[PDB]
Amino acid sequence: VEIYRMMRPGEPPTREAAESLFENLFFSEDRYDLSAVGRMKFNRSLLREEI
Amino acid sequence: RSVFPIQSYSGNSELQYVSYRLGEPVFDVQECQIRGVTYSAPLRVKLRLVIYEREAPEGTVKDIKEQEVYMGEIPLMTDNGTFVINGTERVIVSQLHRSPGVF
Amino acid sequence: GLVRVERAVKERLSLGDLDTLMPQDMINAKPISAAVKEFFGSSQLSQFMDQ
Amino acid sequence: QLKLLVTRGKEQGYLTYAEVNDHLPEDIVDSDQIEDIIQMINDMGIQVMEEAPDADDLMLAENTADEDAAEAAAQVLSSVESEIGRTTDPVRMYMREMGTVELLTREGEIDIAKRIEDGINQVQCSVAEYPEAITYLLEQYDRVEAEEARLSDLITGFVDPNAENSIDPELAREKFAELRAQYVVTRDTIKAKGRSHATAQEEILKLSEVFKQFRLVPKQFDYLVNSMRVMMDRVRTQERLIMKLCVEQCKMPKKNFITLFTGNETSDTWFNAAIAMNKPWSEKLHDVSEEVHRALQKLQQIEEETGLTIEQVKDINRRMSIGEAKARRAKKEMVEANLRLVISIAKKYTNRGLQFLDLIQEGNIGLMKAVDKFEYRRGYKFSTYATWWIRQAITRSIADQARTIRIPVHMIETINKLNRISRQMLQEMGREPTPEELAERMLMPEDKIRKVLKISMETPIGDDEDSHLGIDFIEDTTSATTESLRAATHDVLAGLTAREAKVLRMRFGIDMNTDYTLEEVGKQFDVTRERIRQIEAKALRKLRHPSRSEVLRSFLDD
Amino acid sequence: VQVFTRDGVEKDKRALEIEEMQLKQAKKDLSEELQILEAGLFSRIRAVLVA
């Protein structure tokens, strides 16, 4: 809800869209990708072992 | 492969896929200066649809339809590693960017 | 482009009795001609080559 | 934001003081303002706070209001609007403004339509009651049959009976004999026994019953209501002026006008009683009373204009506005009840079309014609009404509105028929578009389609298309060049052969202010005949030498 | 030098002479190519015979 405010000040925090507005920053059909190349760099800069 | 099959949010239809294609050109590099039109050819895509038993419990499927459709254009490239676009060799420069993920 | 512009297809896919309609019947054709022809001719990295 | 608190409080029929933080307006902070604004939260919602009841629930049933008609039920717009986010979009404020209506659909807006009709069809009962309005109603027709031989004029665009449209030409003519009979008695039997004294009230009531069928086109109806509004203000201007003169001339404020006027309105009788009162103000009237008779005699001269008395105006013209208070609450409330359906249709078309916003607000005006012509009396629903009319008001809002260019609408959206058809062309010929394919896809020749496409895209400089050659410009602002081509042709065609130099000026307007056939020209050629015409063309073959135009060609260029 | 139009209008005289300027080249070259081609292909058949 406070993240909905951070994109929509002075507008009602519509309960289910308050969750979508944040999770679709990183999990939407349109709004996030890395390729396998960027997931590799993500895991690499975190010293993971998950290939 | 990152968008299709669009099995619809409405739960009653699905716009399936199989693969892209390129084909059907008409201009060539000489006409792409003398006339001027960008050396290009149509992007066409293999698409499908499938629907299930509305009425019975022993066959699981009822309809299947599949074809091609248009979905855009693509410029074309020479042995010389060039392209011809509005009378001229307009050509993409490659980028050197921060690798995706986290920094 | 496949997740921002397909609106009339993504819309009207919900409504028809697709046992008797087809995987094509609302796909517009104008934009992905010029928008991919001229991705080599007016894009942010697609200058006239240094001939 | 606010809606959460007020809605859950009204659902509960009760709201505890501290629940202002359990269902908080996600807006503001005004904690010390609470101790008086709680007042209009309680006269229509009363509750307080203590440890625990045991048998004490009933309190609301002797202490609360009863209709939520227009008050904190709608003025709460300000208290839900008040925090629009200082830089962030019209596509936010409408979400606060629709903090009013939730979803009154499927019977609530039908009850708004029921309440339109106990408005309009009850205003009708006072059109039938104000004795000038039922006169001007028939004056509408008596203005036009009175000239011995007519068919149209104010006979047409009138009569207009929504008797659920169930009439014929003679039952339509009976509207000026049936109701005319009910009128011509009542019109003077309002003075028999008294204005509404015994049967005068029943006579008014039965005229007001037949006039329930006289439900009419919104502007033939509202002409009769505007007539009653204006004829009320013939008196209300006089009251408004004479009350002001009680202050300004007499020094007798507000309440003391009402104390004397409102029981003998008609004449300077009550003003002479206002002298008879004594007191220093009334005492001053003994040497200025003339200036008040010089105004109050034109309240009297309204009863003298009509055979009214203010005794009728006291109630009839208020009964009118008790009908209007329903009719035009409901023709506002019906628009309000549908403000969301306007978004869900309009926002389809707002898809970059011209802007993400403006088409919604034009739909909110298309909704006015829809609310005015809402024929629920066919049976159908406002959803379908919006899908037709309000959708095409949304379409036209950027079809020819807000463009550079605008045409008769068939010739607007036909340009878009071609763009709709192009969806085959770009994949069936399927590499580039070709008008040569569009010719089979339209079964028509390219140029009679280019009729539109030559000019309707953004208009070339075609002055008044080509007709600008023969229009109002034929004055010396053009014809001075004609009086130059004529001079140069008059030169050459007078150095040519002594016979041939006549002929080769005739038929189309070349040389004279009447460029005649034979009679006045043959008499100036002599000897022989229609060589008088053939030599207009003979020039093609021994005037062959192209130098023969060396002094003629400049008049495309001056 | 060139002239172009909406295709249903077959092309103007100054382009229709240049049609025969460009046609000359291919009309000649294809009459050389057919000979250059069979002078290889039938020379392979001729070689299989000479064996």
Q: Give DSSP secondary structure letters for D82-96.
A: TT--SS--HHHHHHH
> Smallest CA–CA separation between B86 and chain A, in Å?
31
**Residues 3-22 (E) with a CB less than 8 A from some CB of B:** 4
Inter-CA distances, D341 with D108, D360, D378, D382, Å: 15, 10, 21, 10
Inter-CA distances, D491 with D35, D545, D548, Å: 103, 18, 12
- B vs E, Cβ pairs < 8 A, gives 3
D427, closest residue in chain B (CA to CA): B70
Q: Is the dihedral of CA D472, D475, D480, D483 positive or negative?
A: positive
* H/E run at residue D361: helix D358-372
* Helices marked H in D174-287: 178-189, 200-210, 218-248, 254-261, 269-276, 280-284
A41, closest residue in chain B (CA to CA): B101
- Interface mutation vs chain D, best among A2, A5, A8, A11, most D CBs within 10 Å: A11
* H/E run at residue B51: strand B40-51
> Smallest CA–CA separation between D423 and chain C, in Å?
6
**Residues 18-47 (A) with a CB less than 8 A from some CB of B:** 29, 33-35, 37-46
d(CA B66, CA D24): 55
- B vs C, Cβ pairs < 8 A, gives 102
* Structure tokens belonging to residue D56: 């004490």
* Structure tokens belonging to residue D264: 């003998």
Omega before D25 within 30 of 0, i.e. cis: no
Residue B67 amino acid letter: Q
D446, closest residue in chain E (CA to CA): E8
B54 close to B84: Cβ distance less than 8 angstroms? no
D433 close to D424: Cβ distance less than 8 angstroms? no
Question: Which chain E residues are closer than 8 Å to B35 by Cβ?
Answer: 2, 4
d(CA D26, CA A10): 8
Q: Among D374, D373, D382, which residue's Cα sits nearest to residue D340? A: D382
Sheet containing B63-75, strands listed edge to edge, beginning at the edge strand earlier in sequence: B6-7, B14-19, B40-51, B63-75
C18 close to B13: Cβ distance less than 8 angstroms? yes
Inter-CA distances, D545 with B59, D488, D511, D541, D548, Å: 92, 18, 23, 9, 6
* Structure tokens belonging to residue C33: 């001609």
d(CA B38, CA B86): 5
Residue partners of D162: CB distance under 8 A and separation at least 6: D215, D216
- The residue written with tokens 């073959």 in the block is D541
Q: Among D303, D254, D251, which residue's Cα sits nearest to residue D282? A: D251
Question: Which chain D residues are closer than 8 Å to C27 by Cβ?
Answer: 423
B29 close to B58: Cβ distance less than 8 angstroms? no
B41 close to D431: Cβ distance less than 8 angstroms? yes
* Structure tokens belonging to residue E32: 């050389």
D493 close to D504: Cβ distance less than 8 angstroms? yes
Maximum distance among all alpha carbons in chain D?
A: 134
Residue B75's CB: how many other CB atoms inside 10 A? 22
D543-549: long-range pairs with CB below 8 Å, 24+:
D548/D492
* Structure tokens belonging to residue D203: 């006579």
Question: Which chain B residues are closer than 8 Å to E15 by Cβ?
Answer: none
Residue D194's CB: how many other CB atoms inside 10 A? 12
D250 close to D274: Cβ distance less than 8 angstroms? yes
Residue B9 contacts A, CB cutoff 8 Å = no
Residue partners of D396: CB distance under 8 A and separation at least 6: D362, D409
**Residues 42-101 (B) with a CB less than 8 A from some CB of A:** 99-101
D400 close to D407: Cβ distance less than 8 angstroms? yes
d(CA D64, CA D318): 27
For residue C41, count CB atoms less than 10 angstroms from its CB and return exposed for 0-12, middle for 13-18, buried for 19 or more. buried
Residue A33 contacts C, CB cutoff 8 Å = no
**Contact residues, chain C to chain B, C-beta under 8 Å:** 2-3, 9-10, 13-14, 16, 18-19, 22-24, 27, 29, 32-43, 45-49, 51
C42, closest residue in chain B (CA to CA): B90
B14 close to B47: Cβ distance less than 8 angstroms? no
- Give CA C20 to chain center in angstroms: 25
* Structure tokens belonging to residue D167: 């009439």
> Smallest CA–CA separation between D315 and chain A, in Å?
47
D328 close to D120: Cβ distance less than 8 angstroms? no
B102 to A42: CB separation less than 8 angstroms, yes or no: yes
d(CA D274, CA D277): 5
Inter-CA distances, D497 with C37, D329, D500, D531, Å: 68, 90, 5, 13
d(CA D546, CA D548): 5
Question: Which chain C residues are closer than 8 Å to B8 by Cβ?
Answer: 13-14
D342 close to D363: Cβ distance less than 8 angstroms? yes
> Smallest CA–CA separation between D84 and chain A, in Å?
5
D69 close to D84: Cβ distance less than 8 angstroms? no
Q: Please state how this structure was obtained.
A: cryo-EM
3-state secondary structure of D221: helix
D548 φ/ψ angles, rounded to the nearest 5 degrees: -65, -5
Residue D557 amino acid letter: D
Residue partners of B55: CB distance under 8 A and separation at least 6: none
3-state secondary structure of B66: strand
Inter-CA distances, B4 with B69, B71, C3, E27, Å: 14, 13, 11, 49
Question: Which chain E residues are closer than 8 Å to B34 by Cβ?
Answer: 2
Q: Among D226, D237, D358, which residue's Cα sits nearest to residue D301? A: D237
D483 close to D512: Cβ distance less than 8 angstroms? no
Q: Among D262, D256, D298, which residue's Cα sits nearest to residue D279? A: D256
DSSP E48: H
D176 close to D138: Cβ distance less than 8 angstroms? yes
Interchain contact E/A (3 or more Cβ pairs less than 8 Å): no
A32, closest residue in chain C (CA to CA): C3
- Give CA D474 to chain center in angstroms: 41
E7 to D439: CB separation less than 8 angstroms, yes or no: no
> Smallest CA–CA separation between D446 and chain E, in Å?
9
Residue partners of A6: CB distance under 8 A and separation at least 6: none
Q: Among D186, D164, D188, D160, which residue's Cα sits nearest to residue D175? A: D160
Residue A38 contacts D, CB cutoff 8 Å = no
DSSP B93: P
Residue A10 contacts D, CB cutoff 8 Å = yes
D188 close to D306: Cβ distance less than 8 angstroms? no
Listed resolution, Å: 17.0
D254 φ/ψ angles, rounded to the nearest 5 degrees: 5, -85
d(CA D454, CA D446): 11
d(CA B84, CA B38): 6
Q: Is the dihedral of CA D517, D520, D524, D527 positive or negative?
A: positive
> Smallest CA–CA separation between B35 and chain A, in Å?
38
Question: Which chain B residues are closer than 8 Å to C27 by Cβ?
Answer: 69-71
3-state secondary structure of B22: strand
d(CA D487, CA D469): 20
d(CA D41, CA D272): 49
C4 to A30: CB separation less than 8 angstroms, yes or no: yes
Question: Which chain B residues are closer than 8 Å to D427 by Cβ?
Answer: 42, 44, 69-70
* Structure tokens belonging to residue D431: 């590499």
A42 to B103: CB separation less than 8 angstroms, yes or no: no
Q: Is the dihedral of CA D467, D470, D472, D474 positive or negative?
A: positive
* Structure tokens belonging to residue D311: 């005794």
Residue A16 contacts C, CB cutoff 8 Å = no
d(CA D459, CA D469): 18
Q: Among D7, D94, D17, D544, which residue's Cα sits nearest to residue D359? A: D94
C24 close to B47: Cβ distance less than 8 angstroms? yes
- The residue written with tokens 């993500």 in the block is A42
Residue D279's CB: how many other CB atoms inside 10 A? 11
d(CA D224, CA D218): 10
Residue D524 contacts B, CB cutoff 8 Å = no
* Structure tokens belonging to residue D548: 């023969």
- Give CA D325 to chain center in angstroms: 20
The angle, 0 to 180 degrees and rounded to 10, between the axes of the packed helices D254-261 and D218-248 is 110
Q: Among D161, D124, D118, which residue's Cα sits nearest to residue D327? A: D118
Residue D511's CB: how many other CB atoms inside 10 A? 14
**Residues 420-479 (D) with a CB less than 8 A from some CB of B:** 426-427, 430-432
d(CA D313, CA D151): 37
Between strands B40-51 and B14-19, the pairing is antiparallel
D246 close to D256: Cβ distance less than 8 angstroms? yes
